[PDB]
Design a binder for this molecule. Structure first.
Ligand SMILES: *[C@@H]1O[C@H](CO)[C@@H](O)[C@H](O)[C@H]1NC(C)=O
Ligand SMILES: *[C@@H]1O[C@H](CO)[C@@H](O)[C@H](O)[C@H]1NC(C)=O
Ligand SMILES: *[C@@H]1O[C@H](CO)[C@@H](O)[C@H](O)[C@H]1NC(C)=O
Ligand SMILES: *[C@@H]1O[C@H](CO)[C@@H](O)[C@H](O)[C@H]1NC(C)=O
Lengths: 188, 148, 108, 302, 49
């Protein structure tokens, strides 16, 4: 009964109290009313700033991120990489690229504000019509797929958790077990 | 037929590399039998307290650079790519006095006449579309979290 | 609000014959090897086959403990409705017969 | 025909009804900005064994050293050692040495937590939820030739659509394998898949993702999210020179940038969807004992 | 519903207590009560509450 309960609760040692955080998106109430420990921000003066400034039910996170916003993406990557930050809200394409580049960075569940990448033009520039048709000309054939092949599609239990010290004890106590026999030499 | 292009150093899209000796790009190949068509681009070093004035010729390549090369291959025009003088996309911020709004960043260098076409990871929203016209999108994304 | 056990029973009786066959090959045996073959899976080359069958013995009951621990823990089924968002209530069938009192508050 | 003949020929104002956007439609009208990501898709249905062996060599050498101290444990310590990993209740050897008994008390106690860790690995195997897939996308070797595999399978689309025109302007020889094998209805593809008369079904990805929310038993799963595919957006058509486009685009981007599109994505898009199957492990189970009986032919002649 | 740690839990739903509600206080004799109460029951009935 003791080995049955022990075999049960050693398996339950890694089931109940797991790091199952799994925030996966915007709807975490720990981030709705944030503390100063779950640190999250974005690029100062970006599209994310206006997108969270317009929405009246996401202003509170704004009042967090006004204390933490940065200027470049790579400095935020290095800050969250060494755990100086704790979360990072950003565009999904850049994060899915850099998580594939470096496997310590992990992307997660939700895909909100489904938008697209545009091209800045004037009001009535003559380079508006044929360029907007040429983008979809690239969509209809596989040239956008070839550019995805260049960059986007382009990629790059252990049973030693709690018995490592037990492994050290097995590798070490053999000398003491033979020293017991050296004591038994003096017993004879 | 010489359209001024402005962009920003985006980590999957616009790779900015310093030149080798003097204005020369290390013309490396791809993994498929194609040299990376880099372009000579200008732009500053870093932030205004850090770098007051450091603009060297640089090598820009990647995704949107290939998109611009496809557009210049299809439509008959040359270009001259520079970069923006800060690290901001562009927002709607009041200046100190006169009760006047301003757009900085890529829209700042656009609406000042210093650019004519922004090829960048440009997020489409209601505010920018009220002031500049957009084309149809070429890559669709959302928003998510990066964790460890 | 078992299936692959016949394959195991065939394999253990293949072992219960081929142990005696290797005992004839290698330089009462019928009462020893059969009782050994019944005794291993239930808790020198003949010893090699015995220790290989003993190594494949405990993985069977380990996988049986695994799928019983997965069989009476996980699948507490969706015999309930999950409330108003039921796909068998947005476009219903005869699977979930749901209604209320005729001429009542729920109808209003 | 249909809506575009009413729009272009000055009989309809705008196409609020849902419509794909490709290149040759845009030449005669002015489409609005897109709002939903609509591609196209297809609706279908290491060191443990080494270092434990090293520890087995160490413990076997110490078991030889027991008899070197002070009795048939000369070379047959392996037949007790790996046997007591599993606790098989097999009479093997009674250790007459105290060193051997203490060493077995170390070894079997390590084997208890080792098999408990193996049950933890099986619990993680229970955690490991898999969903196998077959086809990468449109450029598969299945699609390019039906004789590439031994059954020539059948794929079909909806007639007179934008998908067929994308095929006819991108892959002409692909179209004649589908031309004999067409189908008409939306639910006719569901009939053809649940009856198995038709292998594949190329269609717009978002409507198929909607149809996945009402599949009987959720047995039909598509391929990805349109990775090797069209990847366009649904947009409202207008006429050329109509001043309504500037209002409609700003109204759509107002609808997106405040969550007003998100509630409609929640409502009108249904976002839904204990036995033994270990043949990849059972193959190794049979083949290790096949190697063990293959070593018997080596041990016979010597 | 927003505490970190969740180390503070009540006992069910307060089963041995008053079990009252929050309303809108008005003066004794004001004609707004009849118009406010129907609108509040309408706000309950359409699921907007
Ligand atoms: C667009 O392309 C057509 C092709 O004939 C041409 O007539 C027209 O001038 C072009 N407009 C510009 C300047 O983009
Ligand atoms: C670029 O960056 C630093 C900091 O702004 C500046 O002082 C210097 O001119 C440049 N140094 C390097 C690393 O090239
Ligand atoms: C393209 O541009 C060149 C330079 O302006 C011009 O001379 C030529 O006529 C054009 N040719 C094509 C292919 O349109
Ligand atoms: C106002 O001008 C000062 C000096 O240039 C500057 O420090 C400050 O940020 C300005 N405020 C704004 C952005 O309106």
């Amino acid at each position: 009964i003791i080995v049955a309960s022990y075999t049960a609760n050693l398996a339950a040692f890694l089931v109940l109290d797991r790091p199952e955080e799994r925030i996966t998106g915007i709807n975490d109430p720990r981030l709705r009313n944030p503390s100063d420990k779950f640190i999250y921000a974005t690029v100062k003066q970006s599209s994310v700033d206006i997108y969270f400034r317009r929405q009246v039910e996401l202003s509170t996170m704004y009042r967090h991120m006004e204390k933490h916003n940065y200027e470049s993406a790579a400095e935020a990557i290095q800050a969250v990489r060494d755990n100086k930050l704790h979360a990072f809200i950003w565009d999904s394409a850049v994060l899915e690229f850099e998580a594939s580049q470096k496997c310590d960075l992990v992307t997660t569940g939700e895909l909100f504000f489904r938008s697209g990448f545009g091209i800045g033009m004037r009001k009535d520039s003559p380079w508006k019509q044929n360029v907007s048709l040429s983008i979809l000309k690239s969509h209809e054939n596989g040239f956008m797929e070839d550019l995805d092949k260049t960059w986007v599609r382009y990629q790059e239990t252990l049973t030693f958790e709690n018995m490592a010290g037990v492994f050290m004890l097995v590798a070490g106590g053999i000398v003491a077990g033979i020293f017991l026999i050296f004591i038994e030499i003096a017993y004879k | 037929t010489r359209l001024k292009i402005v962009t920003i150093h985006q980590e999957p899209f616009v790779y900015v590399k310093p030149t080798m000796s003097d204005g020369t790009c290390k013309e490396e190949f791809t993994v498929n039998g194609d040299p990376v068509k880099k372009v000579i681009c200008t732009g500053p070093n870093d932030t205004s307290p850090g770098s007051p004035r450091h603009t060297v010729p640089q090598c820009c390549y990647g995704f949107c650079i290939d998109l611009l090369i496809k557009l210049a291959r299809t439509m008959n025009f040359t270009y001259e790519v520079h970069l923006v003088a800060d690290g901001k996309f562009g927002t709607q911020e009041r200046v100190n006095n006169s009760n006047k709004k301003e757009w900085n960043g890529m829209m700042g260098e656009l609406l000042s006449g210093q650019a004519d076409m922004i090829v960048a990871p440009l997020t489409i929203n209601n505010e920018r579309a009220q002031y500049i016209e957009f084309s149809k999108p070429f890559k669709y994304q959302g928003l998510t979290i990066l964790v460890k | 609000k078992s299936t692959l056990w016949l394959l195991v029973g065939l394999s253990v009786h293949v072992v219960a014959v081929m142990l005696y066959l290797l005992d004839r090959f290698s330089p009462l045996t019928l009462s020893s090897a059969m009782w050994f073959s019944w005794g291993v899976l239930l808790n020198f080359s003949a010893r090699i086959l015995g220790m290989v069958w003993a190594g494949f013995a405990m993985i069977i009951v380990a996988s049986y403990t695994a799928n019983l621990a997965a069989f009476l823990v996980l699948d507490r089924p969706e015999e309930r409705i999950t409330g108003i968002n039921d796909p068998r209530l947005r476009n219903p069938s005869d699977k979930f017969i749901y209604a209320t009192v005729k001429q009542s508050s729920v109808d209003i | 025909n249909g809506m575009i003949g009413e729009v272009v020929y000055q009989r309809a104002v705008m196409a609020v009804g849902s419509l794909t956007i490709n290149e040759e439609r845009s030449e005669v009208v002015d489409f609005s900005v897109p709002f939903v990501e609509t591609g196209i898709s297809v609706m279908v249905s290491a060191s443990v064994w080494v270092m434990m062996f090293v520890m087995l060599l160490i413990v076997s050498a110490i078991a030889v050293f027991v008899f070197e101290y002070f009795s048939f444990t000369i070379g047959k310590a392996i037949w007790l050692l790996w046997g007591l990993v599993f606790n098989n209740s097999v009479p093997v050897q009674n250790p007459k040495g105290t060193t051997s008994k203490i060493m077995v008390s170390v070894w079997a106690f390590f084997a208890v937590i080792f098999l408990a860790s193996y049950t933890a690995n099986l619990a993680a195997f229970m955690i490991q939820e898999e969903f196998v897939d077959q086809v990468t996308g449109l450029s598969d070797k299945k699609f390019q030739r039906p004789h590439d595999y031994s059954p020539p399978f059948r794929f079909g689309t909806v007639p007179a659509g934008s998908t067929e025109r994308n095929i006819r302007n991108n892959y002409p020889y692909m179209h004649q394998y589908m031309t004999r094998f067409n189908q008409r209805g939306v639910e006719d593809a569901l009939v053809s898949l649940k009856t198995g008369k038709l292998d594949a079904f190329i269609y717009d990805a978002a409507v198929l993702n909607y149809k996945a929310g009402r599949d009987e038993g959720c047995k039909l799963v598509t391929i990805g999210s349109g990775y090797i595919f069209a990847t366009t957006g649904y947009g409202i058509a207008l006429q050329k020179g109509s001043p309504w486009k500037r209002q409609i685009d700003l109204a759509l981007l107002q609808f997106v940038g405040d969550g007003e599109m998100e509630e409609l994505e929640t409502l009108w898009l249904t976002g839904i969807c204990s036995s033994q199957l270990d043949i990849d492990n059972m193959a190794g189970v049979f083949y290790m004992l096949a190697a063990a009986m293959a070593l018997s032919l080596i041990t016979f002649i010597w």
